[model samples]
Target: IRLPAHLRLQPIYWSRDDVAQWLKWAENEFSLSPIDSNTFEMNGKALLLLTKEDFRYRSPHSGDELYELLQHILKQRPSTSIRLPAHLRLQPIYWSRDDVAQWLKWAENEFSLSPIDSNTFEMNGKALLLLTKEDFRYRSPHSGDVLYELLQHILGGELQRKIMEVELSVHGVTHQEAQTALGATGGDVVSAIRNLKVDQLFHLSSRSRADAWRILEHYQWDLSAASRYVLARP
Candidate 1:
């Protein structure tokens, strides 16, 4: 079988054939002295787990070179825009079947997309995490690139929220309790949004709750006019 003339591979997903190709290319690069193909007959997974020291030991003459090249290859791995302290709950490896679909629904809503049948995608979090852009292309020709990008984006937000929930747990709130606290607090999301709509009203008008509501609502919640009226009064 013939490999593609041009291929870009992330070290973590590199197959044995890719590694073999990479080995010869490294030899050609001059960083790696002529390496025996048999020495690294392992898959990318095995290769990724090795440390810099492991590389040096493997190819005393060219291990450092290999390690640097390995790093370069690893850097080609897909990245998410969302940044947060890494956590297991945020990881796709633990997502359940429904969890995967929940994300599908969310992606559909956020992107204003056509139906992305989770059933067609198959499997769950762990499987999706292994998905490449090529795999996404198989899913939807038009939405492929955008879907993968947003998948990472949604996961990023979920992970960041999970991180916050962990902090709340440290304060003795259970997940449901945290949900209740959110609704109770509202401003955090449930309330924050609810409050902001009225926040400008109160900020610009009289401080009295009922008084401000009456005046602001009369002006159709127009802050400037209401504030001017309030200022003109006293």
Candidate 2:
């Protein structure tokens, strides 16, 4: 089989004997190495295995032909063990199982995290963790990315909603204005409201939280300029 450079690092899943037999057939038809260092490391980690689909991509062969070859090879060697590198080689991220599990537990407790199911859950309705089978297999079932998204949603989802509601109901603000205010003040509702109130107290017609932000940004957020600018706005 013609393998590429990166593929050299991946181990073949089949046992040595089965691979040897398959090599014999290939040798009769083509010129290639019967065995190599990469194939030598074959054991059974499902993650490290070269699936038939993988070969399909590498070789120009029909599905049925490859399937027949696979059946013959498997009939010779029913199964094989997965090879684990010295490092616990989970793909994507190589952190140890305990480290991954500890992080998962911490996030779960911190967020009161209870997933609706394996694929996804409802948090802010708009927010969802897009889980997949490959993601679970390559990493832990509760992978770090899942916890990360959950943490972001837990920390900001309700606060964003409340800030948006307060801006609209209390100040008749637009959605964009509320978003700008929340983002400007680092999601501090009280600070955002105070900014709006101060601008209005100066009889500034453009008195929403966002206009206060513009003045701050315009004046380079100088404390000295802020009070005077608010008082001086026409």
Candidate 3:
């Protein structure tokens, strides 16, 4: 089955006895230390022991096939876990609440990221996704590169300016607030953020009630042709 990004398909375990002989061979051949009992971690969280018999490295190929064998094992089996160094762990960002709002704006307009739900956001034509950790997994359902592109677009200057501009005027944010949201900007970004969103967008995230006010101010909202938001105004 094609696994959706929304779902996490963990590896299913078979039986330890199935590969027990191979495990012993690996330890003896490579002088690898025994991993307690060798009965396989409960539920096979750590199973699928490799041995010299199963070990073979192929000449690398170009294009998708370059890593095709590895990809198949990881995606289909769920028994595989990629090793990553501590340096590869997720980096944290510190931001004020106001600054976070600004970053959201940049994500929406400049990168065309859209809110899918109160706690979920979508971008890169749905290839990339973001949601609160409580809502789902840390990584997007699409490939890492797709999500990276969406993030890169939001981080770039054109998008950041668009976000900072609206954030300052609509949200009554200051220069410092913009900095808090966007990190550092060279040149006169302070002046650039002023009066930027003379025109407003059709939609805004639910985070700020004040943003709702801006959209309502003009009373020129356009409901999507596919939307069902009709209410008779008397």
In order of appearance, the predictions have TM-scores of 0.34, 0.27, 0.20
Q: Which ten residues in a row have the lowest lDDT in candidate 2?
A: 39-48
- List the candidates ranked by lDDT, beginning with the highest: 1, 2, 3
Clashing pairs in 1: 186-191, 186-192, 187-191, 187-192
Over 1-234, each residue of candidate 2 has an lDDT whose tens digit, in order, gives: 443333232234434344334445554554543433232122222212334544443344443354455555445533223222333233313344353444444434432333314233322222223444344324433233334433343445456565776476345567777777777898787677666655553354446667666666676645346657666666
RMSD of each: 13.7, 18.4, 18.6
Runs in model 1 lying further than 4 Å from the true structure: 1-6, 76-234
Report residue 91 deviation for candidate 3 (angstroms): 26
Model 3's alpha-carbon lDDT is: 0.34
The CA lDDT of each predicted structure is 0.59, 0.44, 0.34
lDDT of 1: 0.59
Backbone clashes in each candidate structure, one number apiece?
4, 6, 0
Leading candidate by TM-score: 1
Give the per-residue lDDT of model 3 (tens digit) for 1-234.
343232223432323342344344444544655533322221222222222121221111121221232245466653133222233222213333333334344433332222313233333213222433223323422112222433343335455555566365444466566665444334345433322332223232323445434444444433231122222211
Best-to-worst TM-score order: 1, 2, 3
Which tens-of-lDDT digit does each residue in 1-234 have in candidate 1? 122354375555566667778878777766546877756555564455455665665578887988787776556555323222233235576877777676666655444445677775767788888898668757865345556765665565764474455334323345664555455564265342223335555665556767776776688755566678877875
